[PDB]
Design a protein around this ligand. Structure first.
Ligand SMILES: O=C(Cc1cccnc1)N(Cc1cccc(Cl)c1)c1ccc(-c2cn[nH]c2)cc1
Ligand SMILES: O=C(Cc1cccnc1)N(Cc1cccc(Cl)c1)c1ccc(-c2cn[nH]c2)cc1
Lengths: 302, 302
């Protein structure tokens, strides 16, 4: 037993991290087969970043301006294109360590592992969630751009995130691996607004189930509630409205613990209205919404 | 910016995880050069675990009883010995992916990455700390035994932990890679007592420095205190007494932030005596002691 914010094992992704240099600027890139993916603002100079015309900037560029280094093996660039906010650098050698992979655009609320990188070398690994407002709360210093997020299913890496920018608010924003930003963000150094970030209600319920499984039962109570009335409380407290789909997904947790979803909802209501009065749940003095039902199932059965 | 519980990248260690089977029992093992390290209670049957005579049990055993599988490559066992609470299985083939490694016995308070494994396959990765009482708070299900903890310096994996057991209290205990338990624990299924677990004071101070670096300054106050009087407060609250060595180690953090260590100590005193009154520090409603000064330096400079 025990419960931890657990990342996926990062080796399959380690073998794909490269360094990409365009003039003075250096960031990370993702080498899969014979294509290297990286943020297009690699082609900007520091002043270019306030109002960059990416097409015009890319036009001044030719294949040989893009220095791509994998460890120390230098890669020869044979083609270059711009897809949305990513650069696709066609190179001459397929990555021999390309794992089986897919590009997926994840849904707000889902989670993924991030492998923070600098200069094409991996720094560290941590789990995080696409927030309802399409930001993420991570750990990214200058040069970490192009670090990727991913899930691992079976034998297959599903890349879902590439990091592009730190907002003035200190949270982080980026794209899918087709270069479409998550959220309303654009890759210009202008001040930009992340909306209201609500709490992922279904995730908090899955976390309470994990807590029950692991001995923490003090929040279990003699009440229940209803989807509609619970949701009234959820709206008071900037929680995501709960739906029948969310209830179904909590099915297996309900069944293994023998606690109806709506009863757990009443417990959560009580916590929302009366706080935690100084106790803890699975080691935290706050309600945790960055575990999905699937995360709990995965960790509680190996 | 941003601050996260970050694990080391796990690939170098992924390439060393094997599966070890002795009769009915299966757990994980660590293949470095031509030696496989695993917990000796692999040689026990479920009933054997209450009062096992490990020497006698090992004597009934020969090289060919030990089924060692790396992925699907089966390893031939050519020698076997017991070192403290680990089995050293000499095999015929050196691990081609052996990284540069060392065995180190870490000190309470230091941290490391854990790669949780089942059936010799890696499940996930997370950071954790050797608590002052030599337990760890992790995520370990049956079959996770032999999962290892490690740090990565430069180009070199320093293995410090192998997981052996879950205490009835739900925390976790294990050995160094020479098979010496951390703490007073023995590998018998008897009830065993982890002592009082105090809080790692120097780690909490490093965390407050990280918080300051990242915008959270609300706990900074107009006081200071003294090593002795601070330590009186620390003792009231089951914190580790702070020493001049701890102060020196916080040197670089002090210098980069321009905050004297004793001033940060006065802030921490105030937090200990008056709580947090419902606010948060780097996203947590509790004082965090599982970052070392070195962890903060590492994450805040890349
Ligand atoms: O945030 C970042 C990157 C970052 C920093 C720290 C942590 N994470 C990400 N910016 C600001 C920013 C603002 C608005 C939109 C975006 Cl896309 C980026 C950034 C990006 C590129 C350059 C640059 C230098 N030479 N050429 C281009 C300079 C600043
Ligand atoms: O805790 C664990 C392992 C564990 C479980 C879950 C998470 N982590 C670790 N035990 C109990 C225990 C008690 C006291 C001392 C120790 Cl060393 C182990 C355990 C170990 C081996 C066997 C066994 C089965 N067949 N042969 C041997 C059975 C139980």
């Amino acid at each position: 037993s025990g419960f931890r914010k657990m990342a996926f094992p990062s080796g399959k992704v380690e073998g794909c991290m490269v360094q990409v240099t365009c003039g003075t600027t250096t960031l990370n890139g993702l080498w899969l087969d014979d294509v290297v993916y990286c943020p297009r603002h690699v082609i900007c100079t520091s002043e270019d970043m306030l109002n960059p015309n990416y097409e015009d900037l890319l036009i001044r560029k030719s294949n040989h301006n893009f220095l791509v280094q994998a460890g120390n093996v230098q890669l020869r660039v044979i083609g270059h294109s711009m897809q949305n906010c990513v650069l696709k650098l066609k190179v001459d050698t397929a990555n021999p360590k390309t794992p089986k992979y897919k590009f997926v655009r994840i849904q707000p609320g889902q989670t993924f592992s991030v492998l923070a990188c600098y200069n094409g070398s991996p720094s560290g690994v941590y789990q995080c969630a696409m927030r309802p407002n399409f930001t993420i709360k991570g750990s990214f210093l200058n040069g970490s751009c192009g670090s990727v997020g991913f899930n691992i299913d079976y034998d297959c890496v599903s890349f879902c995130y590439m990091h592009h920018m730190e907002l003035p608010t200190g949270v982080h924003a980026g794209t899918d691996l087709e270069g479409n930003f998550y959220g309303p963000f654009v890759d210009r150094q202008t001040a930009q607004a992340a909306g209201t970030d609500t709490t992922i209600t279904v995730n908090v319920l899955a976390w309470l189930y994990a807590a029950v499984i692991n001995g923490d039962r003090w929040f279990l109570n003699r009440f229940t509630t209803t989807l509609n009335d619970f949701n009234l409380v959820a709206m008071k407290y900037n929680y995501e409205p709960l739906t029948q789909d969310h209830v179904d997904i909590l099915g297996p947790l309900s069944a293994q613990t023998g606690i109806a979803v709506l009863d757990m909802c009443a417990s959560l209501k009580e916590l929302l209205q009366n706080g935690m009065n100084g106790r803890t749940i699975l080691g935290s003095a706050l309600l945790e919404d960055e575990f999905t039902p699937f995360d709990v199932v995965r960790q509680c059965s190996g």
